[PDB]
Amino acid sequence: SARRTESDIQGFHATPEFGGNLQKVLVDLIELSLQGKQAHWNVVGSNFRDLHLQLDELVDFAREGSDTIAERMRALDAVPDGRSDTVAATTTLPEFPAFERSTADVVDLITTRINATVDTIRRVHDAVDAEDPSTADLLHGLIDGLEKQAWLIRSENRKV
Amino acid sequence: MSARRTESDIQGFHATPEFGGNLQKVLVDLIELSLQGKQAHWNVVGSNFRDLHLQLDELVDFAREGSDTIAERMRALDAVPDGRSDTVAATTTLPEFPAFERSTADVVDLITTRINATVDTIRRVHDAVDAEDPSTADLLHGLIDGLEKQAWLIRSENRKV
Amino acid sequence: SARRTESDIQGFHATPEFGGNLQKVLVDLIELSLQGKQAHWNVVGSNFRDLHLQLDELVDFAREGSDTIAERMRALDAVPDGRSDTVAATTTLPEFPAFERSTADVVDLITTRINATVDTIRRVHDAVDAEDPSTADLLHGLIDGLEKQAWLIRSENRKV
Amino acid sequence: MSARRTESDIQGFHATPEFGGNLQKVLVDLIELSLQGKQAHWNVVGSNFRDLHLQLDELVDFAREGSDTIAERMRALDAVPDGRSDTVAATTTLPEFPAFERSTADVVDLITTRINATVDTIRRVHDAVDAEDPSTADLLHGLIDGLEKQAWLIRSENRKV
Amino acid sequence: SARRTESDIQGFHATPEFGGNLQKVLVDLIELSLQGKQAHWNVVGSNFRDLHLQLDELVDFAREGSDTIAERMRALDAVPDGRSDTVAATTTLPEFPAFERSTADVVDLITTRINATVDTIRRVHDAVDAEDPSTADLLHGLIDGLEKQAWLIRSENRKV
Amino acid sequence: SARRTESDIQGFHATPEFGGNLQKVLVDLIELSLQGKQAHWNVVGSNFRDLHLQLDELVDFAREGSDTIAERMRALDAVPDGRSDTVAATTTLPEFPAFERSTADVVDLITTRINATVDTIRRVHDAVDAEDPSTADLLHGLIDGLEKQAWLIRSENRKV
Amino acid sequence: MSARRTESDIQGFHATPEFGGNLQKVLVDLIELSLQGKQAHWNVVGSNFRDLHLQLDELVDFAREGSDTIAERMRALDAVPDGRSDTVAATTTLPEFPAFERSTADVVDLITTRINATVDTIRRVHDAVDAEDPSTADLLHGLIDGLEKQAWLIRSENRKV
Amino acid sequence: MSARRTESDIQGFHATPEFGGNLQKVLVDLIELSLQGKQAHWNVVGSNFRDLHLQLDELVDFAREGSDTIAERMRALDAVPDGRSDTVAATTTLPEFPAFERSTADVVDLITTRINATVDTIRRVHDAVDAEDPSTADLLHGLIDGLEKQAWLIRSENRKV
Amino acid sequence: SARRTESDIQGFHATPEFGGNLQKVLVDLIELSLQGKQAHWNVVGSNFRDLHLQLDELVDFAREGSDTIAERMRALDAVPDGRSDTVAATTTLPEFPAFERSTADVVDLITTRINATVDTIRRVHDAVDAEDPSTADLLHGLIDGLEKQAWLIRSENRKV
Amino acid sequence: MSARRTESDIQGFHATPEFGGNLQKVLVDLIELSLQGKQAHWNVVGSNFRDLHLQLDELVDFAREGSDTIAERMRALDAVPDGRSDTVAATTTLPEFPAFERSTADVVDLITTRINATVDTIRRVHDAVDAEDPSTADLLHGLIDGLEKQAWLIRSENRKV
Amino acid sequence: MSARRTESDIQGFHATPEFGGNLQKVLVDLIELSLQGKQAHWNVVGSNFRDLHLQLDELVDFAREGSDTIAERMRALDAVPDGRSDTVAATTTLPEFPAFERSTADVVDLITTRINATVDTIRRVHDAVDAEDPSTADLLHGLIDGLEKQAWLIRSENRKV
Amino acid sequence: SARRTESDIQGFHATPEFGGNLQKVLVDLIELSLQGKQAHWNVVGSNFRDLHLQLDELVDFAREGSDTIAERMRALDAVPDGRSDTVAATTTLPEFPAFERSTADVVDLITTRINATVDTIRRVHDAVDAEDPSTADLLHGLIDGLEKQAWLIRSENRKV
Ligand SMILES: [Cl-]
Ligand SMILES: [Cl-]
Ligand SMILES: [Cl-]
Ligand SMILES: [Cl-]
Ligand SMILES: [Fe+2]
Ligand SMILES: [Fe+2]
Ligand SMILES: [Fe+2]
Ligand SMILES: [Fe+2]
Ligand SMILES: [Fe+2]
Ligand SMILES: [Fe+2]
Ligand SMILES: [Fe+2]
Ligand SMILES: [Fe+2]
Ligand SMILES: [Fe+2]
Ligand SMILES: [Fe+2]
Ligand SMILES: [Fe+2]
Ligand SMILES: [Fe+2]
Ligand SMILES: [Fe+3]
Ligand SMILES: [Fe+3]
Ligand SMILES: [Fe+3]
Ligand SMILES: [Fe+3]
Ligand SMILES: [Fe+3]
Ligand SMILES: [Fe+3]
Ligand SMILES: [Fe+3]
Ligand SMILES: [Fe+3]
Ligand SMILES: [Fe+3]
Ligand SMILES: [Fe+3]
Ligand SMILES: [Fe+3]
Ligand SMILES: [Fe+3]
Ligand SMILES: [Mg+2]
Ligand SMILES: [Mg+2]
Ligand SMILES: [Mg+2]
Ligand SMILES: [Mg+2]
């Protein structure tokens, strides 16, 4: 009686611009995870262990995040690209340096990397929100989680 | 010194009748989706039976958690949900699920359509809900995200090349 | 040597009468679950919380039950119908009333609803047992579980 | 005052030789089903491999718990189970599982047939078991229910339309 | 619609005889639990640890059993009596001795008392089944579990 | 490559007004937690157990909430103050009474104080959302959870 | 071997007959409380049934753990517990629990009284127990604390302020 | 009914006003410590931030469990706790925690001092509490042991050897 | 740039001789599991319970082992045969005797059965290692686990 | 009396540059496999979508645990891993995963090929690794076993008859 | 700041050298017991091997937790534990455990004796420990209770009644 | 049938030299565990908490290791000696100092003693592998785990 009578009800399709905006988030989340592991392995020095552990927590969050974004793309029939060549070619994050790095350096480097990742999400936010408020909520989760990680990591170098 | 309020009776946020009706719309479609999800779960047969059988239960779990969330949000805001079978049948916007066994391919299309319809209800009421109460719109976002994920996980069986 | 040599050994098929008997159980278990949730949301008053919680436990049991019955039907190649229209059209349970209801009223209403559900199972029991003793065991589980729920709920209103 | 019994030696329920033999029949078919279930689990290939691979392990787990239940029920009732490979091979009623790889479609039919055969043994001994010991028949009901569920979950892959 | 009319649908209630039969099972399960704990504490000698542990498993099973029976009585409008005076005065189990007892003696004593408990259940079974098959299924679980315990305990003393 | 150049990419920092708004939410969440525990310990009378338990769930939620807000302040370079003197001097919640209180009185008192807490969050919401939508999502979780608690608590005193 | 004792047989701390007697007093009242708690758990009816039904089981769990603790502490100290039904009935200090269904109000009063009697036993033996073995007194403190908490959680139902 | 008491009303152990006062002293300092611990948890910055951030939460968890333990022990003994913000601020013996971000070195020293003040309160009331109720003294021992462990785990950061 | 350009890269194929060597391990692991259960059911006498329990742990290990070996065969495109007829026809283990057996006898019998199973693994070891060192590691796990079980079981009969 | 060593500085095992390079080779292929595994996980569509979607995540989990193991083994032995995106892309031996959606059948072949390639790298460096450090070769064996199992579980979808 | 102390540095409770010495005595015997327990765990042979093998590990678990508890209690009170092998061997009061395989009967007697020696140490220092710090005496009570339980569970094997 | 004839199939037994080699590993693992606990309790100073925690993880690993080796000895008919006098008299580890020690000193000391322990295992490895490859796999696990611990501990003191 209130039942719709069409047999093919279509779902919400993301525009290609929307898809491209999420793609920007995706490559930076993947880059951050790869850099996070690099730092996790190669960090040395005063308070090694805390940083080693916190960096894995960052990587866990970024990996869950990239999965969330890529699957949101798929849900809206966009198609993610998380391949190494694409990530390296299109990430906005400054390159992580080679070799062992002191804990103090890793703190500063990773804080910058996180901040760059958050900047990407904040940059695409309003365009994403305008087309799909539900996706913007996922972006909010990422902003909150990553900014927490930035605070947890950077506080090591804070002098008061 | 003190910023303490003096009132002994402080009231909670009360939903408008329109707001209540909008959440009721979401509720009946979520319950209907749960019932149809179980029907499909029992009655699907054919190529890749098991995957769909399993995925349908995850859909049902999500839709059930969703309807409890919406109904309780109604209660929180002094609205009164109606999830009785007669009301659900008489007021759901979902096309009826067909009777008896259905092929995996058919169940995929059928259930995808019914998730799409459920999501459409939530998207239709979204702006009016968000305008009155942003906190409730957030619950709607969770439902939209979770259901559209289910739709992707189910529908992809039938997507070719 | 004791191995059977037929390549197609058929399983036990339920008669359509058997299927129909389980269908009767199924719609009442589903109706009970829907009514149980209605009560769980709309119950108000003295000892709200206990009833709110106990009603969810009832719903959990009834939902597990309806799954058990519908899957037993499928196991024996019967075909369940748990659709809203069928449930509303064929349930034997008295309708649950609209609106907020006091805990005392909900206690009496739900006890009656449970008792109606058990009555259906007891009514079909002997016919089910005659064709398939293994299914009757599932009915026994339902009778025991539901009658426990009736006692747990009704005891609230018992005056001694 | 006191209803206490005075006997220092109170005996337990002892199964008849016929009862023991009937449970032995159930036992060998359950073990054989477990062995064939694993064979199929390793050797299935083709369309929807993974689902069947996984479902077969659940079948094996159930059949294994079942054979331990039956064997221990025998022990409880002063009967002596024989689950040795030679006895199982020489006395099982199940058709032999074929050797080497088998297609998903073939494994579905083959295993469904072997579950049906296992259940048939339990159904054949049921009335004689129930007559002597209703508590043991209840264990049989659990096996019948659990195995017929497995048969449905496996066979539905091959059921069309 | 097939909806029933009644507002006060009543549940199945047990006969006095039925309640009395469940009461008999109840006192013997409670007695067995108390005797099980006595044995658990006071057993000494060869293979103490195994028997000490197994006896706790027996107790767990008997306590779950007593609760099951007593709650089934409640569901069916019967009233259990599990009080110490009642258990002592009405149990059919041979008295368990005081003081330390050898493992071999404990095996024999507890096996006898388990068998006594199973005997009570087997004695009331047919009258219980005839009135309410659902309750008889609970009895079957008890017979099965306790007879398993008898086997696990008595096997210690078996020769060849 | 799309890689950014900067070596010291900074994170989003909150305005003084924003930090002040989160501080307001923080003191009321801490106050509510302290009042929740007071009520939890000192409630007596009809349906004591339900209220005793529910109040602990309220406290759990409020404590998780306070930590969330305070850590969001830290992430955004604001500085929380959750000290007892500050909470007492700046909380907007009506004072909770000392001494034993009836269940009915506790229901009314705590419902009022939950509502006061939600009011603070709702009052700052638009200013918070305008500056940082990601933080507003945290506020939504709080509004949703606390308003759920108000419903679960107040329903005890509802008549018909 | 600088500080090593060279004794082949080093004996354990042994409880006096008085100490054993004192723990036996605690043991029977803990067992009686457990049995009465279950009686109440089953037969309680009326306003706030569920809360009381549930709390009474928590009481029983605690009293059962307590009795096992005391009995095994006796065993550790070469004393011999007697937790048999006849002994418990003949020697408990707890007032008898009445038969039949009892209202929640009545059960609250009854059970509070019986908990308080149990705590009184432990409090009565405490100083003698502490004088001989402080480690056992600590076990009593656990019991006192746990049981008085139970009494508060149960009795608060009947409080009018 | 051989040893059974026949009293209808058996009353529980009641704390004296002095005893209630003594537990109240412990309660406010435990609550103040929890609030200061969280303040420190949030605002600590600098070398070894994470270890301290994490340890401070463990301190808070312990102090929160402790305050609930003491308050409910008061309830059990018919005393009435007051854990309200005004009462805690007006009656705590703990030195005030400073505002703003503080270095890890400073936080270590500050928090060690505040833990030590809390332990001092418990140590000050211990003998009076033990004299009236040994079971409550045991709860104090738990608190002393747990808090002094926290002090060691925190202060060791600033140790130079 | 270092990327291989072939679209079909083949994996490592086991030789049929390798497959046959693992098949030898497989049938003995299955036979051991079947014999282990036989012993687990039929063991009686002094220290029954310990043996009953330890025998199930042996069976668990042997079942996990046979799954590991059969799946390693499949991974390398060999094809296992764990059918009852094949196991009975090709196992190297001495037959387990019928009927109840004393704990002392079961200890000696099962120790021999385990030792025979380990001997098979040790016999094929060097041929397996020569073709695939990764498979030999799985054999090492089996040798270590089974030899542990032999020690745990046999120690019961050791007189010193 | 004493077998104690006297050195205050005892060095750990240090890998040769060649050993480090060999583990680096394994590392980049494991990371590349993880990235391609996720790509396939998101982008697979068609017959038996769900099974492959799920199995691919298990592959990714294994490859991720593997790369952390190898990288940390490098660190343990004074070698320095490079898992950055540029290095992985520039030095992986895996054929590139294609862009956009791919059918289940194609994903099966593609991913199987890429696992085979990853395993080939480990098998190629194996003997040189084992010669210098047998303990590291054991870690390689785990990877070989786990990946070849994944290859079987994925590839069997496409294997016929 | 009404009741707030204004001291910048509030120091913790410090153990006397006698108290530290007393805990050190308990510590070495707990460590020795753990090492002897493992020796017995490994080398026990004969009738009822498994029960003893398993019980001995539970003993070791308890003794290891106990030693950590005592050592960290020392740390909390500004005392310094020494749990090094040389110190333990030179200062333990436990009779030496013999080398080689030992029968279950012998192990029961040996280990009971060694547990009893350990408990004796704790019992010997108890009053001095309690006099200075009642909170530490409670930790001793835990140890006494736990170890005497272990002695009962082990020694009961060799009892003939 | 391929069934073997023997009734008393014996297991692999280790040479005196092999048992002696495992004994060497055993005493150094026990010593390391005792030294690990000493360090765990007595470390003070900068980054205390991290080192305190990590040292417990080292101890856990070494204790699991000692049990593994001692039980492998038992499986192979060797007899472990883990007694305090034997460990003290035969351990190759440099003595750990008494008294409080700084974090930096503890890092250096424990790293040296871990390396000493790994050295023992590496010294006996080839003789162990030649006799029994299955035991050498257990040695590999130990080398891998301990060398991981050395890295996690020593990195604290690494400069740049
Ligand atoms: Cl699956
Ligand atoms: Cl509750
Ligand atoms: Cl940490
Ligand atoms: Cl055991
Ligand atoms: Fe929003
Ligand atoms: Fe939002
Ligand atoms: Fe029946
Ligand atoms: Fe039945
Ligand atoms: Fe049953
Ligand atoms: Fe949200
Ligand atoms: Fe104490
Ligand atoms: Fe090797
Ligand atoms: Fe190896
Ligand atoms: Fe004391
Ligand atoms: Fe204590
Ligand atoms: Fe290995
Ligand atoms: Fe995923
Ligand atoms: Fe709910
Ligand atoms: Fe289901
Ligand atoms: Fe079993
Ligand atoms: Fe119960
Ligand atoms: Fe936090
Ligand atoms: Fe016990
Ligand atoms: Fe509490
Ligand atoms: Fe498997
Ligand atoms: Fe890692
Ligand atoms: Fe520790
Ligand atoms: Fe062990
Ligand atoms: Mg209530
Ligand atoms: Mg640190
Ligand atoms: Mg599939
Ligand atoms: Mg034993």
Tab-separated table of N, CA and C in Angstrom, chain D residues 12-13 17 27-28 34 42-43 46 50 62 64 72 79 91 97 107 109 112 130 136 144 152 154-156 159:
chain	number	residue	atom	x	y	z
D	12	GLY	N	24.756	-48.948	37.721
D	12	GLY	CA	24.301	-48.053	36.653
D	12	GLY	C	23.548	-48.811	35.569
D	13	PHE	N	22.851	-48.071	34.705
D	13	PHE	CA	22.165	-48.621	33.525
D	13	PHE	C	23.164	-49.277	32.553
D	17	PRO	N	23.449	-55.987	24.389
D	17	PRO	CA	24.337	-56.141	23.221
D	17	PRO	C	23.773	-55.530	21.931
D	27	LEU	N	28.404	-44.949	15.099
D	27	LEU	CA	29.785	-44.543	15.270
D	27	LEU	C	30.634	-44.653	13.994
D	28	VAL	N	30.642	-45.832	13.364
D	28	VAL	CA	31.478	-46.054	12.168
D	28	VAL	C	31.097	-45.141	11.003
D	34	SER	N	33.495	-38.213	8.700
D	34	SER	CA	34.555	-37.270	9.080
D	34	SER	C	35.773	-37.386	8.167
D	42	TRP	N	40.111	-31.113	1.324
D	42	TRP	CA	41.415	-30.951	0.656
D	42	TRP	C	41.315	-30.943	-0.871
D	43	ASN	N	40.433	-31.776	-1.406
D	43	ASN	CA	40.505	-32.131	-2.815
D	43	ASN	C	39.490	-31.486	-3.744
D	46	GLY	N	37.377	-25.758	-8.109
D	46	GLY	CA	36.466	-25.176	-9.091
D	46	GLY	C	35.615	-24.057	-8.537
D	50	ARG	N	36.063	-21.995	-2.210
D	50	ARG	CA	36.301	-21.570	-0.823
D	50	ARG	C	35.148	-21.894	0.122
D	62	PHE	N	31.486	-31.191	13.275
D	62	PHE	CA	30.240	-31.728	13.822
D	62	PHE	C	30.262	-33.261	13.906
D	64	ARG	N	32.915	-35.239	14.002
D	64	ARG	CA	33.888	-35.590	15.044
D	64	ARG	C	33.345	-35.457	16.465
D	72	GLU	N	31.355	-42.221	23.701
D	72	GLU	CA	31.347	-42.016	25.153
D	72	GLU	C	30.029	-42.441	25.795
D	79	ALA	N	29.122	-50.362	27.175
D	79	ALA	CA	29.404	-50.883	25.834
D	79	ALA	C	30.795	-50.415	25.390
D	91	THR	N	33.058	-51.930	7.821
D	91	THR	CA	31.661	-51.935	8.308
D	91	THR	C	30.814	-50.689	8.012
D	97	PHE	N	34.143	-42.577	-0.915
D	97	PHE	CA	34.466	-41.311	-1.570
D	97	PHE	C	35.477	-41.610	-2.671
D	107	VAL	N	31.581	-32.723	-5.609
D	107	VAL	CA	31.762	-32.796	-4.150
D	107	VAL	C	30.446	-32.524	-3.410
D	109	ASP	N	27.308	-33.065	-4.516
D	109	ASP	CA	26.428	-34.246	-4.651
D	109	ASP	C	26.946	-35.413	-3.823
D	112	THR	N	26.685	-34.664	0.075
D	112	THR	CA	25.245	-34.687	0.411
D	112	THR	C	24.741	-36.131	0.519
D	130	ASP	N	15.587	-45.560	21.163
D	130	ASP	CA	14.591	-44.817	21.951
D	130	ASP	C	13.801	-45.703	22.918
D	136	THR	N	19.495	-41.512	25.214
D	136	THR	CA	20.388	-41.720	24.064
D	136	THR	C	19.722	-41.270	22.748
D	144	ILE	N	20.952	-36.021	14.035
D	144	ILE	CA	20.031	-35.920	12.895
D	144	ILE	C	19.858	-34.450	12.479
D	152	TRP	N	21.767	-29.490	4.020
D	152	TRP	CA	21.121	-28.314	3.410
D	152	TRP	C	22.140	-27.246	2.995
D	154	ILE	N	25.320	-27.517	2.357
D	154	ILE	CA	26.192	-28.021	1.293
D	154	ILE	C	25.424	-28.183	-0.036
D	155	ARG	N	24.303	-28.912	0.003
D	155	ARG	CA	23.542	-29.271	-1.204
D	155	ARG	C	22.962	-28.077	-1.981
D	156	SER	N	22.656	-26.984	-1.271
D	156	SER	CA	21.966	-25.824	-1.859
D	156	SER	C	22.761	-25.127	-2.971
D	159	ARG	N	21.329	-26.704	-6.108
D	159	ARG	CA	19.884	-26.576	-6.318
D	159	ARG	C	19.590	-25.397	-7.219
